[PDB]
Amino acid sequence: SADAQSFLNRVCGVSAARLTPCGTGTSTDVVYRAFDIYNDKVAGFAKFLKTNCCRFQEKDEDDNLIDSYFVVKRHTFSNYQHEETIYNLLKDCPAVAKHDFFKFRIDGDMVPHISRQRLTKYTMADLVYALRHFDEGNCDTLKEILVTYNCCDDDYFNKKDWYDFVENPDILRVYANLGERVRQALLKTVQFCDAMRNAGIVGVLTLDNQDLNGNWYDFGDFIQTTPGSGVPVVDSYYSLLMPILTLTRALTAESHVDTDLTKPYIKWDLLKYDFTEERLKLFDRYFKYWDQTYHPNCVNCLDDRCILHCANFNVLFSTVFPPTSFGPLVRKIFVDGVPFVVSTGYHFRELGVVHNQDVNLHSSRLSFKELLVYAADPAMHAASGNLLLDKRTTCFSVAALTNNVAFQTVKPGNFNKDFYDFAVSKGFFKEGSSVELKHFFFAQDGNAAISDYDYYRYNLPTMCDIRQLLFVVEVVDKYFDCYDGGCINANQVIVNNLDKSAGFPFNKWGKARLYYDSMSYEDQDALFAYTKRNVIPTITQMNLKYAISAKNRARTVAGVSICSTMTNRQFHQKLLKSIAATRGATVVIGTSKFYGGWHNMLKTVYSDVENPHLMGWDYPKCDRAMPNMLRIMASLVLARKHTTCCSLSHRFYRLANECAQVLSEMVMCGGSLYVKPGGTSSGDATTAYANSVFNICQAVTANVNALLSTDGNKIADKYVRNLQHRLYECLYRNRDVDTDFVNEFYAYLRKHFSMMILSDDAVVCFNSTYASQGLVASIKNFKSVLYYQNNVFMSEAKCWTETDLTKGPHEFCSQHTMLVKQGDDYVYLPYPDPSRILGAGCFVDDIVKTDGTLMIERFVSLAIDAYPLTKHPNQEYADVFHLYLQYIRKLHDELTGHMLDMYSVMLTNDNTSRYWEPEFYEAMYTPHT
Amino acid sequence: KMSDVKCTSVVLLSVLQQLRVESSSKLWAQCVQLHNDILLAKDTTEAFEKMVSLLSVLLSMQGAVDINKLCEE
Amino acid sequence: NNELSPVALRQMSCAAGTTQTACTDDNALAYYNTTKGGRFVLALLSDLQDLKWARFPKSDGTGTIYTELEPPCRFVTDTPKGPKVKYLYFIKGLNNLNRGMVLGSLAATVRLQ
Amino acid sequence: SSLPSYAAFATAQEAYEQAVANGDSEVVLKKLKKSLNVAKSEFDRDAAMQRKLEKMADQAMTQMYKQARSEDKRAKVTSAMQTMLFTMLRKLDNDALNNIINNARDGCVPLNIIPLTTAAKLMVVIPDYNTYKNTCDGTTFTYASALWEIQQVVDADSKIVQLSEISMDNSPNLAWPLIVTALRA
Amino acid sequence: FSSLPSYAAFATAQEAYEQAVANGDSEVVLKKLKKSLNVAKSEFDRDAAMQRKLEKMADQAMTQMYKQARSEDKRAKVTSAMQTMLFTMLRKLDNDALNNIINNARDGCVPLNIIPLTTAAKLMVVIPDYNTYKNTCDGTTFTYASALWEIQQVVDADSKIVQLSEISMDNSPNLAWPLIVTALRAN
RNA sequence: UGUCAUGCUUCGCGUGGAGAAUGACGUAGCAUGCU
RNA sequence: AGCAUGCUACGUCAUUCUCCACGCGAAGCAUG
Numbered sequence A: 001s002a003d004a005q006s007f008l009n010r011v012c013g014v015s016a017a018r019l020t021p022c023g024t025g026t027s028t029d030v031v032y033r034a035f036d037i038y039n040d041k042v043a044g045f046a047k048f049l050k051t052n053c054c055r056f057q058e059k060d061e062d063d064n065l066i067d068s069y070f071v072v073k074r075h076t077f078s079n080y081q082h083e084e085t086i087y088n089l090l091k092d093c094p095a096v097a098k099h100d101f102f103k104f105r106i107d108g109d110m111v112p113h114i115s116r117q118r119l120t121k122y123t124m125a126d127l128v129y130a131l132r133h134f135d136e137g138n139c140d141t142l143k144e145i146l147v148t149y150n151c152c153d154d155d156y157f158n159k160k161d162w163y164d165f166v167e168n169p170d171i172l173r174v175y176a177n178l179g180e181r182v183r184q185a186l187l188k189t190v191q192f193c194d195a196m197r198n199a200g201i202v203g204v205l206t207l208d209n210q211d212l213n214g215n216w217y218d219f220g221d222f223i224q225t226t227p228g229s230g231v232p233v234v235d236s237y238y239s240l241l242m243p244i245l246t247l248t249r250a251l252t253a254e255s256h257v258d259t260d261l262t263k264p265y266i267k268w269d270l271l272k273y274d275f276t277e278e279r280l281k282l283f284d285r286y287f288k289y290w291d292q293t294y295h296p297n298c299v300n301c302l303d304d305r306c307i308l309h310c311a312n313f314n315v316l317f318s319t320v321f322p323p324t325s326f327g328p329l330v331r332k333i334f335v336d337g338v339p340f341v342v343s344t345g346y347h348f349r350e351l352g353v354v355h356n357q358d359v360n361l362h363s364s365r366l367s368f369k370e371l372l373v374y375a376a377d378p379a380m381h382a383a384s385g386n387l388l389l390d391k392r393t394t395c396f397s398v399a400a401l402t403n404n405v406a407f408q409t410v411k412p413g414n415f416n417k418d419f420y421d422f423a424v425s426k427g428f429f430k431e432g433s434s435v436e437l438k439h440f441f442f443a444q445d446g447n448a449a450i451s452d453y454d455y456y457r458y459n460l461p462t463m464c465d466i467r468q469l470l471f472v473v474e475v476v477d478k479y480f481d482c483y484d485g486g487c488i489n490a491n492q493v494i495v496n497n498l499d500k501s502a503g504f505p506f507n508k509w510g511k512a513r514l515y516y517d518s519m520s521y522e523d524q525d526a527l528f529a530y531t532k533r534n535v536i537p538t539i540t541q542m543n544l545k546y547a548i549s550a551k552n553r554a555r556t557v558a559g560v561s562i563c564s565t566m567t568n569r570q571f572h573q574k575l576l577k578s579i580a581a582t583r584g585a586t587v588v589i590g591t592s593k594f595y596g597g598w599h600n601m602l603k604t605v606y607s608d609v610e611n612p613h614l615m616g617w618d619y620p621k622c623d624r625a626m627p628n629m630l631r632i633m634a635s636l637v638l639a640r641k642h643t644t645c646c647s648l649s650h651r652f653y654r655l656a657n658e659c660a661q662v663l664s665e666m667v668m669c670g671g672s673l674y675v676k677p678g679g680t681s682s683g684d685a686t687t688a689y690a691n692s693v694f695n696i697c698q699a700v701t702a703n704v705n706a707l708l709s710t711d712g713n714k715i716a717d718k719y720v721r722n723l724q725h726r727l728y729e730c731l732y733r734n735r736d737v738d739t740d741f742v743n744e745f746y747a748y749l750r751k752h753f754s755m756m757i758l759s760d761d762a763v764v765c766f767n768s769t770y771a772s773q774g775l776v777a778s779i780k781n782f783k784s785v786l787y788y789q790n791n792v793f794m795s796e797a798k799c800w801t802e803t804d805l806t807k808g809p810h811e812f813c814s815q816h817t818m819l820v821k822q823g824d825d826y827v828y829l830p831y832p833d834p835s836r837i838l839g840a841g842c843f844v845d846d847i848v849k850t851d852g853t854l855m856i857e858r859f860v861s862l863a864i865d866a867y868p869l870t871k872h873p874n875q876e877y878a879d880v881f882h883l884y885l886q887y888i889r890k891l892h893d894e895l896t897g898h899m900l901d902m903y904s905v906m907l908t909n910d911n912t913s914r915y916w917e918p919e920f921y922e923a924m925y926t927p928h929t
Numbered sequence B: 001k002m003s004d005v006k007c008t009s010v011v012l013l014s015v016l017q018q019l020r021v022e023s024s025s026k027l028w029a030q031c032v033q034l035h036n037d038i039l040l041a042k043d044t045t046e047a048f049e050k051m052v053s054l055l056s057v058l059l060s061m062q063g064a065v066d067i068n069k070l071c072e073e
Numbered sequence C: 001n002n003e004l005s006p007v008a009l010r011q012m013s014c015a016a017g018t019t020q021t022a023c024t025d026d027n028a029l030a031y032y033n034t035t036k037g038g039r040f041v042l043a044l045l046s047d048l049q050d051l052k053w054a055r056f057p058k059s060d061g062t063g064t065i066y067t068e069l070e071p072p073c074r075f076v077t078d079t080p081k082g083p084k085v086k087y088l089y090f091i092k093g094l095n096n097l098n099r100g101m102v103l104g105s106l107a108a109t110v111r112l113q
Numbered sequence D: 001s002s003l004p005s006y007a008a009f010a011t012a013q014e015a016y017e018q019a020v021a022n023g024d025s026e027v028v029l030k031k032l033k034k035s036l037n038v039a040k041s042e043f044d045r046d047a048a049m050q051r052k053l054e055k056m057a058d059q060a061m062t063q064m065y066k067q068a069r070s071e072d073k074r075a076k077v078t079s080a081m082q083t084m085l086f087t088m089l090r091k092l093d094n095d096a097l098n099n100i101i102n103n104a105r106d107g108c109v110p111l112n113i114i115p116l117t118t119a120a121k122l123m124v125v126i127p128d129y130n131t132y133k134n135t136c137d138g139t140t141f142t143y144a145s146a147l148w149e150i151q152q153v154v155d156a157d158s159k160i161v162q163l164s165e166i167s168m169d170n171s172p173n174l175a176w177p178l179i180v181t182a183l184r185a
Numbered sequence E: 001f002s003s004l005p006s007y008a009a010f011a012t013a014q015e016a017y018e019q020a021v022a023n024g025d026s027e028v029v030l031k032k033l034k035k036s037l038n039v040a041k042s043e044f045d046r047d048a049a050m051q052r053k054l055e056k057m058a059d060q061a062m063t064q065m066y067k068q069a070r071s072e073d074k075r076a077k078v079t080s081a082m083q084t085m086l087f088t089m090l091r092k093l094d095n096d097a098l099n100n101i102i103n104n105a106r107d108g109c110v111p112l113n114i115i116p117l118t119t120a121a122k123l124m125v126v127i128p129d130y131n132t133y134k135n136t137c138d139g140t141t142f143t144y145a146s147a148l149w150e151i152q153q154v155v156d157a158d159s160k161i162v163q164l165s166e167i168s169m170d171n172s173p174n175l176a177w178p179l180i181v182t183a184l185r186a187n
Numbered sequence F: 001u002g003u004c005a006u007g008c009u010u011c012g013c014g015u016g017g018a019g020a021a022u023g024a025c026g027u028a029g030c031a032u033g034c035u
Numbered sequence G: 001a002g003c004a005u006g007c008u009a010c011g012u013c014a015u016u017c018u019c020c021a022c023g024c025g026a027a028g029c030a031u032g
């Protein structure tokens, strides 16, 4: 305590600060902190261990510690000179922490020291790392950051799920208490940049050189040039920080007057729909030194790689403006000298203002196409309707189209007593058996359809890291390059079922057949051509489902209009029909499990992976919680097949139409028009394929995050150590696409991470010795990526792993796998849940299905599904297939006995003897066909 | 006897729905709650209590069904 | 440790003029790196202040590319016999990182005062 | 077989028996073979036509049976459900269900849903003295295999009758439809 | 086309064999009558096949024509229905407030979401519980969207009329929620 | 009120190949007529 | 020997069923 007190007094300086010894200067301190690093050896945003610093903590009067630290260091004589010279230029900035340079005597040597004064304990890199790599079992840093700034108390974490966005929505509020601080940082950084440019300093701004007040304190890698011409490089700062700006709602002080949280809100003109100037002001205030050009309206964008860039900022800035200014833009026209109200534009929260190019005032007469277009849009349905204030939901309600509110209910379900009695007589449904009933028809009351719609409160505005998304999009476009696409004519479109509903209002006059036969090919082609330079809003109708399930939750489906589907088929069907005809790809839509398809799919997935393991995951609230940026991305990769048939403007207007009538639109729920925030619509023509694109995007993002957050000084393999140094450059320092590295990363992902994707279901075979070392994604990385990019917490109870590959996936498409012996060779076969089959047998959804003699095809199909259970070690599983065969025999006997009594004819020609013999069902799982 | 009550509840709620109990929101809500609670029950005594409540709902409506004829069949 | 790009640069000698026309040969020095598919001219050093265009020789048949230029910035070098004043123009539409590369390399090469 | 034109295909067949015999007279055997082939083809054609007829007839019969049974199922969907419900309820053989069903059959139905809580209001309609005799014994009321505590009893006309009154001695003195309120014990 | 050649030539075709029955001799005429009968039979077969094909073609053409003509009398009905719907909706617009808001706009464009707010003549409020009713629609007159609304009627989820005096804390458990209240814009 | 895709089973009407049978023109063996 | 007729064999055109390949309708089951 002889030299130690001398050093303490030295550090105290002349600032009149009372310092306690936290870590002695002579005996320094070490910590574990998140750093952004790029030298010629390592590169990444990862959590390392520091030594060099020695910290002292300031105690305020009354002997109480506060959040002020003096951080002394020991520097070599050269960096000392460099840093002092660079600081003597920036000292005047209000966003630069005070420094103190002094030499001290240690072991008979003069050692320099640089002391920074009054720094918060953590930095902004720690905050970003904590919220971007989330593990609920290790949240010490995040908890301390939240508690220190009065975001919550320390008793808030004794709750069940204090971090779950779905179980505990209030957590959002907690995070929103970090907004102002973040915003203040975004201001100070700009000041710093200005100072740099005025002083002639060139350097890279990183997150870990700014504390949580907003002071900058590291100048070791800066250089000097002529005054007045500096260059701050800000690409990995803003990009890494982007997902945090929307989670903590950093720009909520822009809604008040004079940008002060105490003053009231701004009252905007109710007729104002154009906010281009405000968007430019916001961009120039918070992102002044962001190089790439920003277009408030995405009509003027240049590529599909620019629409994402600009739509990110539009997503950020649209939270500041009133919610009543987004939607169709209405105008008054005259037809036959009578006024009409029609849509002639659209104000997208993510794409800006769009105006139709073909607007015709003073019309004379309307043809079938014009009547269809004018009756499809919600202009005159909402204009000529009552006002609505629905307090049961938090979704913007537009209007009420009638004088009543409809309350729709679901019915119980029917009981097939004869089959149940037969099964009971066969020794089923006893006490303590392994096969029982779990799937029933659940009933619902009148409030089902609106309570189901109120789950769109899980869709939140999610800004994305753009420099990373622009790389993931290029790596995802290689999974779709063995297909072909383009536009077809009205002659080449295939419609499977023409007896389906045509949405609203078209369902009041006929089915989908009424409009395909009343509309010549010229009419359909003209409508499709019209949609390429105009925006046609439509209305989707929400309906309840009547189906068997194991859960007490209602299910809804969204039926889209006929104008949407008619023109989406001519745009996407050529590619969608080619994705479903390819065998051996990552996406396995269109492949069957019969005649040896399951075995082929599993063998293709296994491929040649070393130390293989199998994993599978699930997406919580998939359709509801999907962000609006990944859906736009999914639609943009699917439209890259139109390079020759469509120009840039045609492609943009197709994107605008898809957004206006699928992504965000007006929904008809009980006779009232509400506004849909976002997500996915079940009834659109590209649901499964968009879900597949989204799945692959999330998996690739998980892999990138896994690889870039590893030390890099410990990756023994030298190829995988350069593949990480080059990935950081391709993300945060390369601007244009590097075509020779997306191929290398794609091959790397294909050899060590094999995927099998079908809509939102996925199975993965991965190299186990690379995952435990952090070189390929794990389940923790998926949980981390679903938190900041999907606003959802994925629990490690719906995800499964399998270390033995002779047992197959635990589940894929609700089927289990079994390795059976089938004629001299072993093969993987699928089998279902026996309770599902028995429930399908027992409970039917129509009274006419409870007469077996009329329904023998039902049981043939069910036995086809239930055959693979015959080969199960458990004996109560193999006795479901035999039950079905015996019941088929009984039904045939009854039918024959009835035909002889009611009539006098014995059905002369019969071949039904094959249905109750087990050789008819084996052929469905044998490879010959 | 669990798999017997789980089917008797289905038949009973169908019978109630045919008598047009759907025309009262409160009664239909209570019946739906009971019916969906019997189908997710792992204990038999709870299922029997809820069956008693639902059958009382059925028996309140005197003129809807002729119990004497049905019980003498 | 997040350093500026270590990439070094190479010199070319070219010319330019005030407008699309009037371009006169051998009156500017361009900086480039060829590690890309070809040569990318990153910036232009000259002695005059009225330049507003650049005619760089294109590696194609009868190809002449006219790249636009930004406003000047005045630097004082001292490598030759004594102090000299030269103006720098950055190719319009050049991200900040390549500007940092060019400025760092040039400032290291010449003291710049 | 047994078709009207089938006989020829057999007669010539018998002639084929003679074709082998008699040392296979070339001219006779060949002309007979030609006629036999013609007859066989004619009979085969007629048989095919009959088979087509039979297929059509069977399809028609199946369609008619389907329609009849579908209409039958859709017509009787009210008596069948109730009969099934009561068959199943009798098979279950519970105590509470049988108690309440018997009381309902004798006219003592409830007025609200039976509450499954320690303290809840249950109202029942005792029609006659006899149901009162059997169910209530003092200040307790046994229903649905549970004990309830009478808190009030009301007559057909709004009136607060007292337990002391309601006995055989004064059985005819009150309008009989008797509402009884009770709380679960 | 096939009936005529049959009924004409088959007479001679069978007369050829009738002559064989008459004679018995003329074994050469056996082959000659073979030729005659087979020629007539084959020519018939050909013509009859052509006739049957033509009949099927004509039947299919007639069916196609009928189906087409039935798909053009349903285009007209749907056209008329759409026009009637559009005119019915049009005649329900108060062209006094609507014109005011459309004319106060800069270029005539206005967002759709504001048209019901500023021009609608009726309001519907759907209230789940009693606290919401107390805090939103309490009294016989309230304020929403910078305007004054007067309660015109209240009904429950069964479409039964509810009096404003029945909506109290004590009687709340005896109502069928939610309550739908329809109100009229005050002047 | 009853959406988008994919797979499989059953029944019914239509087009193109191969096997068996019946009828006219060409080539081979034997017999009769003209020479 | 040449031509014609008769008997027995091989090569092209019209019908009768029998199996495959391919289209259009109707019903049903399963999956996301």
Ligand SMILES: Nc1nc2c(ncn2[C@@H]2O[C@H](COP(=O)(O)OP(O)(O)=S)[C@@H](O)[C@H]2O)c(=O)[nH]1
Pocket: A031, A033, A034, A050, A052, A053, A055, A069, A071, A073, A119, A120, A121, A122, A123, A208, A209, A211, A217, A218, C001
């Ligand atoms: N704000 C603050 N930071 C601290 C503290 N203790 C350790 N650190 C870490 O120390 C670095 C500063 O180092 P400096 O800027 O001089 O250069 P360098 O070490 O990064 S190289 C930061 O990045 C932090 O992670 C503390 O109490 N407060």
Ligand SMILES: Nc1nc2c(ncn2[C@@H]2O[C@H](COP(=O)(O)OP(O)(O)=S)[C@@H](O)[C@H]2O)c(=O)[nH]1
Pocket: A557, A621, A622, A623, A680, A681, A682, A683, A687, A691, A759, A760, F004, G032
């Ligand atoms: N059109 C249609 N789509 C369906 C249906 N079932 C499921 N999906 C789609 O499959 C994904 C996962 O389903 P979801 O996240 O909702 O959870 P789940 O337990 O029902 S599988 C969602 O993107 C859904 O759009 C359906 O019937 N019709």
Ligand SMILES: [Mg+2]
Pocket: A208, A209, A218, C001
């Ligand atoms: Mg640092």
Ligand SMILES: [Zn+2]
Pocket: A293, A294, A295, A298, A300, A301, A302, A306, A307, A309, A310
């Ligand atoms: Zn742009």
Ligand SMILES: [Zn+2]
Pocket: A486, A487, A642, A645, A646
């Ligand atoms: Zn195209």
